[PDB]
Amino acid sequence: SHTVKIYDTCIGCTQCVRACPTDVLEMVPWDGCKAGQIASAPRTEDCVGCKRCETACPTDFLSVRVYLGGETTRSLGLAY
Amino acid sequence: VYKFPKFSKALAEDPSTRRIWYGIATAHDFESHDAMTESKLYQKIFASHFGHIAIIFLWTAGNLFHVAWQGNFEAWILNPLKVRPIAHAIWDPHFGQAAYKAFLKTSSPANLALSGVYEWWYTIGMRTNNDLYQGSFFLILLSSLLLFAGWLHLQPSFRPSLDWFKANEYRLNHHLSGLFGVSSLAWTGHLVHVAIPESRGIHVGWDNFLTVLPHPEGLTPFFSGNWKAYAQNPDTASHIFGSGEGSGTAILTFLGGFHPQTKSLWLTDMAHHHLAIAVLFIVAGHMYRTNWLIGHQMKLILEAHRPPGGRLGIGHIGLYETITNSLHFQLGLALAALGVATSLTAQHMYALPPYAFLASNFPTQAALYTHHQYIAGFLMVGAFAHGAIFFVRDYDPAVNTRNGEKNVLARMLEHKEAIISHLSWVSLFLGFHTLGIYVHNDVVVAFGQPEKQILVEPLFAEWIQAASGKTLYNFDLLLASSNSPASVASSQLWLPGWLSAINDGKNSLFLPIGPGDFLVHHAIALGLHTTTLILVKGALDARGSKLMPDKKDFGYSFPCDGPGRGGTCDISAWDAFYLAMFWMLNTIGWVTFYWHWKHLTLWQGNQVQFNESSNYIMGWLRDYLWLNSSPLINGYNPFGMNSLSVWAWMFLFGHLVWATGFMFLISWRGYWQELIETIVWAHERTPLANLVRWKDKPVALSIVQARLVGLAHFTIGYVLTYAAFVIASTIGKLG
Amino acid sequence: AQSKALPFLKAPAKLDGSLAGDFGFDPMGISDQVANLKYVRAAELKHCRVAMLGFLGWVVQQYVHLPGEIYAESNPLKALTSVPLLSQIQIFLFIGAIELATLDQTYTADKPWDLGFDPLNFSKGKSEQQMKDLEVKELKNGRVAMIAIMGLIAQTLYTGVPLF
Amino acid sequence: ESTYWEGKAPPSVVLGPFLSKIPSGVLGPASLVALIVGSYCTHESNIFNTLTVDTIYPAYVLGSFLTPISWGLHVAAWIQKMNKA
Amino acid sequence: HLITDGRWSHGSEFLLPSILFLYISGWIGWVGRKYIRTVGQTSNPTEKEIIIDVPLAISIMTSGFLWPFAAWQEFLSGDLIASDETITTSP
Amino acid sequence: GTPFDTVSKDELAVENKAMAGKSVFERAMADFNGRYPAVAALGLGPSAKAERWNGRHAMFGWIVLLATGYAQAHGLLPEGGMDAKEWGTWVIVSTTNGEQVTIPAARAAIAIGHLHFGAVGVFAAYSKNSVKDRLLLEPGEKDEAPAGLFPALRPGLTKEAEMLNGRVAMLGLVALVAVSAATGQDILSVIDQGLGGLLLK
Amino acid sequence: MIYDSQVYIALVIAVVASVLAIRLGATLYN
Ligand code: CLA
Ligand code: CLA
Ligand code: CLA
Ligand SMILES: CC(/C=C/C=C(C)/C=C/[C@@]12O[C@]1(C)C[C@@H](O)CC2(C)C)=C\C=C\C=C(C)\C=C\C=C(C)\C=C\[C@@]12O[C@]1(C)C[C@@H](O)CC2(C)C
Ligand SMILES: CC(/C=C/C=C(C)/C=C/[C@@]12O[C@]1(C)C[C@@H](O)CC2(C)C)=C\C=C\C=C(C)\C=C\C=C(C)\C=C\[C@@]12O[C@]1(C)C[C@@H](O)CC2(C)C
Ligand SMILES: CC(/C=C/C=C(C)/C=C/[C@@]12O[C@]1(C)C[C@@H](O)CC2(C)C)=C\C=C\C=C(C)\C=C\C=C(C)\C=C\[C@@]12O[C@]1(C)C[C@@H](O)CC2(C)C
């Protein structure tokens, strides 16, 4: 499964979570930004690696980073 | 679906066919394997080196055995200029009677030998098919030795530690002195003892070598210091190679130039060369410090080399630990040196043929030059790729930095933009203007007015030729003058031989050059600069850029960073290697095209055809490719076939593999995953085939794998089609 | 200092005490690279035994020959080529059969030179001091034979006189 | 140890424990003498008299080797002079 | 055949055309750089690059005949080269 | 060389006390089985199953060699060479001067007979569930126990009898090849000499 | 022309080099 990391440059704009096609990211409470929220990656087993999450990231060099790793039938997007 | 990639658990859990594909392509990346330590890494690399040397020796033994068994070496000895060497016999059940008849040579269908091994083995003193068999036997014994050593050094009590592997001074002392100097000394011993008398008709085998004196005085002049005695009475100008007629007694001489009969370097010249090289390397092998308190510690040498004014930063202080702890830095250095060395071999074995009767073997000359230049390009690209790998995974900025200031290597990443910008400027400059002059000549000649061509005389290169003694450009410079101190100094040692060879129209020694040579050399410079630009950009930008300031966290080879930020196709350092492979192939193609056309015109005699038509592109296309491709394509026609039929088949095969590479390069993934899904549905929903199901889920090749496969097809097709063309054209044009 | 053979040098670290025949003779420090002295002692003893047998065979072939004609050559180096290849290949196959089991044995055992060869039981009942003395005798004789067999080969290759 | 340097001249340890103790007043004149001798040997083996098989003269050859050496001797002489030696 | 080693005897083959091109190309580069730096200090620098300020463009273009002198009067004042406001990648 | 250790103390050989005693045959078998599993588990290599099968084949082949000698002596074994026009250029052996020496027809016929027998063997190999004695070992099956230096003297159609006769036949083939190589005659010539003359008569 | 004995023993020696190769191959692990 791929690896997804969140960095404290998160501004809690939720654009990553609402762009994930496989429900990998979610918004959790935080105290490091104005919005009081930070993205989390608790379901990386469903991560497919499409990187839509970081295409919607407005922070300078990203706050969500996807590191491709071992492959799985879920991560390979295999309907068969 | 398990246990194949034993070295990687991440791959072994892949349910798709990607596991099998990636298991092959990651088998030799030992540093990325599961449960990996440095000691195991060095030990496995050591054993793999032993197995590799064993493979090389087995390959040489096979060549020797097949020349001894199915060749015509003995017949070729008596008539080297008319008998065509045979590589090995052919047994192919698909042959028709016509193919058998056409490939029939003596007793069985056989392949002509284009490796030049006949001339090489004849020069070093082999005259019998039993001498080759002895060499094959000995080489198989050596292969057995190396395999036993490789097995032994994986045993518990014989596995070397990291300190032994990283002992730089000991390895350098031994490699230099022992390997280079002592191997040169032993080669001089063989050259003299066996080769020198065998060229003079005296047989020196493994029986009468302790009783046949290589020199009549017999080691007396060496100890007495009368070393001139070994140079007295050299081979005359009427000496027949392999016979005592017109021979001499000298063993170490300066003669320069070539043998008047074989048109190759004097055997006594090469023995003296190897003796001098042996002495020099044995001396140089005592430089570094070992257990006897004298020598050099290279850490101190590197650290002490900081310019006092200060322009290289802190100097080379951190380079010792950087190189020692990285196997990719050393691999890149070795590959760059090997690439330069084999480029040197290619450029010198045609200008200064070292083997008897090899100058008149035009197909083998072309094959050898092309082979070595392609190997050179491969080695250079590998050196740069491993430099990029070192940047990605082995480079440590802390080691190469002292109190903010950066050392000589870390400073290469500070002006990396300057380096890349100036490489780009040079590439654009050369490309723009070389293409401009070529297209100007194209248009001007096409319009029927060739006098308006832009033809620049290569005066700088002709100046060098005159400096070495060529009296063809009326420069009267250094050795073209009989009064210059450069000429008076060697007027009694090697000028008469050298001048007689450089000032000869039948040699390849310093071929006469004109405007076509100028333009093609500028094309070669453009190719070199662009390949260097791609490779250097990939190496320096390997650790990150503006589009990906964390590229080092993704490794040397990864597909992309996604469609975000405008698109990040081919952003990894591996992709820079992948792109530079095309430019290396193009540059080597230009070099080999130039060499082959120049030598085809020289051998055929119509050197005016090259000097006139080489200044414009259509000249190349019409007079090299279209003209010399006629014998090759008529290797088989609706009327018959020739022994060149295999070369035409290889020509078409190379074109096919090239275009399949085009498939794998133009069409990307995603289009092949959906098609594979449709095929999967079709297989799953059809009777009589539902009984058979795959264990690994069939998926499309990964992006990086697809790039590799397309590059492999491109390169294999390129090499095969050009080898077929050059060989068949030379054979069919020059008899 | 600690070398008995070279009373002035100090021996290397691995040359001490046990492993009879230890006279501190390792000026080049070869023992510093080997992990232990087991394999090098096994190789030295194999060379010692082969050289003893070679010297004995050299002298006997000088004086005594088998009844057949093929064994009538007096010069051992000339007999190397005069003797039919069948005899030499049989000898080589016998040696290799002895050598493969000991190949499995040598690289792992604590006493690779101890092949268990004692048909006459010359060591049964001997004390430790007597056993060490026997080992010293064997090593001495073997080193002298090695020097001697190399000298015989050199003098036969250089003068043609196989003895004296 | 610590051959690394950033001042005006490197420490004398970079010369080895044989040249580290030579006074600069010895190395300097020795370097000049070696350079002159090597240049003369080179100009006597060649240039002034053309080389021949019968005329090699190990003195001139060995001599000529003092020219490359001279370079090192005067570099060491400067290093010693700047290090108050 | 063109003799481009540098000798003035065959100076009309390469050297004089070389000087002519260097003058013309320096003119082009100088006027382009001057226009870029001039409209780079206005409210909408990007707009003035697709829609050229033809008056200012004509003003700058005819002023390029002094490009060798202007270049060796701006390099002396340090106005030709940036120093450290230029951006650099991560390594 | 001196300031470091070439071999680390953590990587040292340990004497395998598990092979104490264990005569060279048992030691070799254990070393082969431990070093090369999944081919030892199949019964391949120095195994009793492989030895039994090879002994059976050696006995049958002594019979085949006798039959071949008889056929050569008694005017059988067709004469001439194969027809290159009929069987392609792959049957051509050499072309000395304008004539094509082809594979002898006798060699082709003998190869066809050997192909018959080898096909029977291949069928029996891919017929494991219907044959009395399989070729390879089933997972779990354990190799019959080595017979030793001398198998039990049990006359008749016994496992020991077949074992002993297979060993004898394989040794006979080894001796036959050794005699042919050392002396230099044909294999059938050696068999003829070793039968007095009653084969090629 | 080399004899049958010359080719045969070269083949036998090649076999020995093959057994040494698999031993190195198996020692470099699966
Ligand atoms: C005298 C002792 C000696 C000798 C002969 C060798 C020999 C060798 N060692 Mg080695 N080694 C030694 C001592 C020695 N070593 C010591 C003491 C150490 C420990 C410090 C090591 C540690 C060591 C390691 C760790 C490894 C080796 C390896 C090798 C092999 C290299 C591959 C090969 O075949 O190259 C053959 C090369 C040649 C015959 C010569 C090459 C000729 C060059 C290319 C031409 C250059 C000419 C010229 C300069 C070209 C430029 C033109 C000029 C104008 C500039 C080679 C057999 C490697 C190997 O493969 O292991 C099996 C390896 O991995 N050694
Ligand atoms: C002695 C030289 C040498 C050595 C020791 C290495 C060693 C290494 N290289 Mg390297 N390399 C070299 C030369 C060398 N290379 C050269 C010359 C190039 C330029 C072409 C490269 C380019 C290169 C790249 C781009 C990469 C490596 C990588 C690696 C590492 C893993 C290798 C691997 O996984 O193999 C895998 C082996 C294969 C996939 C087999 C490929 C076989 C090719 C396709 C040819 C087979 C087709 C054949 C010709 C069939 C003929 C067709 C017929 C019809 C005629 C390893 C440390 C990789 C790495 O991760 O390094 C850390 C990596 O990404 N190297
Ligand atoms: C007109 C302004 C201008 C100036 C002063 C420069 C100056 C430079 N460029 Mg450059 N460039 C320009 C426009 C300009 N460029 C444009 C429009 C492009 C897009 C095609 C490029 C693409 C480009 C590349 C790809 C590279 C450079 C490089 C360079 C440097 C080396 C010179 C060179 O290789 O020329 C390159 C020149 C060209 C490739 C042709 C430029 C096209 C025309 C002639 C320029 C445009 C004229 C413009 C419309 C005039 C309008 C002004 C008017 C309204 C007043 C140098 C800093 C190289 C570098 O970094 O080396 C250090 C390099 O690799 N440039
Ligand atoms: C053979 C030998 C020892 C053999 C011992 C054997 C086999 C013992 C085997 C057993 O004990 C075991 C293992 C185990 C027991 O349970 C069973 C037996 C079987 C009992 C020693 C030779 C030892 C041989 C030695 C030391 C030889 C020294 C030779 C010298 C000095 C020669 C010098 C010369 O040859 C040159 C150099 C040049 C010539 O020209 C001049 C001269 C002078 C002739
Ligand atoms: C001698 C032999 C093996 C000898 C092995 C030895 C000494 C091993 C010794 C070691 O293990 C120890 C002791 C200890 C180890 O630590 C070390 C070593 C040293 C490794 C095998 C012969 C093996 C001989 C064999 C297997 C013969 C097979 C013959 C067959 C199958 C018959 C075939 C035919 O019938 C056909 C097919 C068709 C007919 O036309 C033709 C024929 C040929 C007649
Ligand atoms: C067993 C054998 C053949 C067995 C054949 C069988 C079972 C055939 C069974 C059949 O069902 C088939 C298959 C097919 C049916 O249509 C026919 C029958 C018949 C029904 C041959 C052995 C053949 C055995 C031979 C040839 C043995 C040769 C031995 C030699 C030379 C020994 C030499 C030595 O003994 C000395 C001299 C001295 C010692 O110290 C050293 C050595 C070397 C050991």
Ligand SMILES: CC1=C(/C=C/C(C)=C/C=C/C(C)=C/C=C/C=C(C)/C=C/C=C(C)/C=C/C2=C(C)CCCC2(C)C)C(C)(C)CCC1
């Ligand atoms: C990336 C990288 C890398 C790589 C790199 C490379 C690959 C490089 C290449 C390089 C090269 C490839 C170089 C080359 C060089 C060359 C030279 C440097 C030459 C010189 C020459 C000379 C000097 C000569 C001279 C002369 C003359 C001219 C005449 C004759 C005589 C004489 C000799 C005098 C590494 C890994 C390291 C690291 C990391 C980074």
Ligand code: SF4
């Ligand atoms: S890849 Fe990016 S987008 Fe696709 S799931 Fe994993 S996180 Fe969400």
